[PDB]
UniProtKB/Swiss-Prot annotation:
E.C. no: 3.3.2.6, 3.4.11.4
Residues binding Zn(2+): 292, 296, 315
Species of the source: Homo sapiens
Site (Pro-Gly-Pro binding): 268, 559
Protein name: Leukotriene A-4 hydrolase
Main location group: cytoplasm
Pathway(s) annotated for this protein in UniProt: Lipid metabolism; leukotriene B4 biosynthesis
Length: 606
């Protein structure tokens, strides 16, 4: 059923368990060890099975203390090489077997990012972190790579003594390596079944702070004390999640703040949530962002898309829940605020892709397509748009939350397609079918472009933003004096961010306009990364030279691509700062993430 996997489908055999034993070598950049897969045959007379491998060197395959025979098919592009394992004895229905595979990862493996010490905070020890999503788990260990298969797993990781290993799991024990006194062994147990793309690993110099009963925050000695402050409210958000979707079933929720070099956004990995450093503003104003990954534990980690075509099932419901979390934090019209923002992001994604492009469909077809090339915000905000539309159509947020609960409770720890979700939607709402039959299903699910209808959003918190932004865009030299510092009296940090987003939408402003904006609003003082980003772009595109240093510092102070790359783009496009931005790139590129380096360097034409 899954077009992105070469392994045996879940209809033949299913992996129920993974016991991982491995060691981390930072000199060779390799994970060497053994992956022991418990396989349950779903049919009689099963003599062989296939697994996904990508750039893996296979030593041997042991079944019941004896080496079996295997063959590695040819690599197909991003899909990798299939691995055929010949079973010694035929398997009956439900007969279970344990296949142990001795494997070593490649240094160029796409699932594992190795960071040099200069690319970390401490500038002393190296770093390692995994990105499995979507299909990259096959580049770590042989497995069935597909969300349609869920498995519990236990792992034992050997790392240099001075470092620490975390995974997505409950930490069990720590013991000095029996055969290597210079190394340590860390143990992990994941009791809840998960797809293999939620297996995560981090190895580096890490400390911890306990910010809640079940919550530790992990990071390097530089960042732990700040993250402990910013994220102190995560326990209350967790309790909100339990209020909406019921008790937390994964048993521990930790947080790992990646080095400042981390280019991407947060990851939902179970029991350990990755956090981007850009979220530390010092005021806790961006902490609510975390509410996304939290909701993943209640929606989409429990109920998983059966194939990646169905990815919307995962994120969409997740988003729907997260905006309810924020809904109770800042109020309802704020939930509407982030809703309208999400619709805006959908607009930009569609017009950038084009309204005819297949990747704008809610259920895509990934057959020959790389899952990471087609990735966009469509399955997030279009899915949320559908569920919000059905919320307002089916009688309200309370009712549709009831639906959400029934959905999770029914499909928890399983995988489903879109048709399954729609079947259960008609089953739950069966009194209301008359309404449901007026939805256009072919258009919403399978048709590109924007959805055929739009939900009704509350405009107040947005209308303030547009009011001020327009005031500045329409301002004339005579007007600039009337502006006062009180204009921000009622606005949130989120509203200020939207204000600078709308004001930046409109292209350069008279230099004196933004110089005044700095005088009254003192935007230079706020360290919030979103607002500071849009503010510094507003300054640089407006030909203000005083912002050159600031725009530069931020560009190299954080590694997030959504920030770094546009800042270097503008600093290059500004003819006054171009040279300086080039040589600054040449200066800091060694400490940049390897991807952001060549990417910003190609943008700078080096
Ligand atoms: Zn997500």
């Amino acid at each position: 059923v899954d077009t992105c996997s070469l392994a045996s489908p879940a209809s033949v055999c299913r992996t129920k368990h993974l016991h991982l034993r491995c060691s981390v070598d930072f000199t060779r950049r390799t994970l060497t060890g053994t992956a022991a897969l418990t396989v349950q045959s779903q049919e009689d007379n099963l003599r062989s099975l296939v697994l996904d491998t990508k750039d893996l060197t296979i030593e041997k395959v042991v079944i019941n203390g004896q080496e079996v025979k295997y063959a590695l098919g040819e690599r197909q592009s991003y899909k990798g090489s299939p691995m055929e394992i010949s079973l010694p004895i035929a398997l009956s229905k439900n007969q279970e077997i344990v296949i142990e595979i001795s494997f070593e990862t490649s240094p160029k493996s796409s699932a594992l990012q190795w960071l040099t010490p200069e690319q970390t905070s401490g500038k002393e020890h190296p770093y390692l972190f995994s990105q499995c999503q979507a299909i990259h788990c096959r580049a770590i260990l042989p497995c069935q790579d597909t969300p349609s298969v869920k498995l519990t797993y236990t792992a034992e990781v050997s790392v240099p003594k001075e470092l620490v290993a975390l995974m997505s799991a409950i930490r069990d024990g720590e013991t000095p390596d029996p055969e290597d006194p210079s190394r340590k062994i860390y143990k992990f147990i994941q009791k809840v079944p998960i797809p293999c793309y939620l297996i995560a690993l981090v190895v580096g110099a890490l400390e911890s702070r306990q910010i809640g009963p079940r919550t530790l925050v992990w990071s390097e000695k530089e960042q732990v004390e700040k993250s402990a402050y910013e994220f102190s409210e995560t326990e209350s958000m967790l309790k909100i999640a339990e209020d909406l979707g019921g008790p937390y079933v994964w048993g521990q929720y930790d947080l790992l703040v990646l080095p400042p070099s981390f280019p991407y956004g947060g990851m939902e990995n179970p029991c350990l949530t990755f956090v981007t450093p850009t979220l530390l503003a010092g005021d806790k104003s961006l902490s609510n962002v975390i509410a996304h990954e939290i909701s993943h534990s209640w929606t989409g980690n429990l109920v998983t898309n059966k194939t990646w075509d169905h990815f919307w099932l995962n994120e969409g419901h997740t988003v729907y829940l997260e905006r309810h979390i924020c809904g109770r934090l800042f109020g309802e019209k704020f939930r509407h605020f982030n809703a309208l923002g999400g619709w805006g992001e959908l607009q930009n994604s569609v017009k950038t892709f084009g309204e005819t492009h297949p990747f704008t469909k809610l259920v895509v077809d990934l057959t020959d397509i790389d899952p990471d090339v087609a990735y966009s915000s469509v399955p997030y905000e279009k899915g949320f748009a559908l569920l919000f539309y059905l919320e307002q159509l089916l009688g309200g947020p309370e009712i549709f939350l009831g639906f959400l609960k029934a959905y999770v409770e029914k499909f928890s720890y399983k995988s489903i397609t879109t048709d399954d979700w729609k079947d259960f939607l008609y089953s739950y709402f069966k009194d209301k079918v008359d309404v449901l039959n007026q939805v256009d299903w072919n258009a919403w699910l399978y048709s590109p472009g924007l959805p055929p209808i739009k939900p009704n959003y509350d405009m107040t918190l947005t209308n303030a933003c547009i009011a001020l932004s327009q005031r500045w865009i329409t301002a004339k030299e005579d007007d600039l004096n009337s502006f006062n510092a009180t204009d921000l009296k009622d606005l949130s940090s989120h509203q200020l961010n939207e204000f600078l987003a709308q004001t930046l939408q409109r292209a350069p402003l008279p230099l004196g306009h933004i110089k005044r904006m700095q005088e009254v609003y003192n935007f230079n003082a706020i360290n919030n990364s979103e607002i500071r980003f849009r503010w510094l772009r507003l300054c640089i595109q407006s030909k203000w030279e005083d912002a050159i240093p600031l725009a530069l510092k931020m560009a190299t102070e954080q590694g997030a691509m959504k920030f770094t790359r546009p800042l270097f783009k503008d600093l290059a496009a500004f003819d006054k700062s171009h040279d300086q931005a080039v040589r600054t790139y040449q200066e800091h590129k060694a400490s940049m993430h390897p991807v952001t380096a060549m990417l910003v360097g190609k943008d700078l034409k080096v």
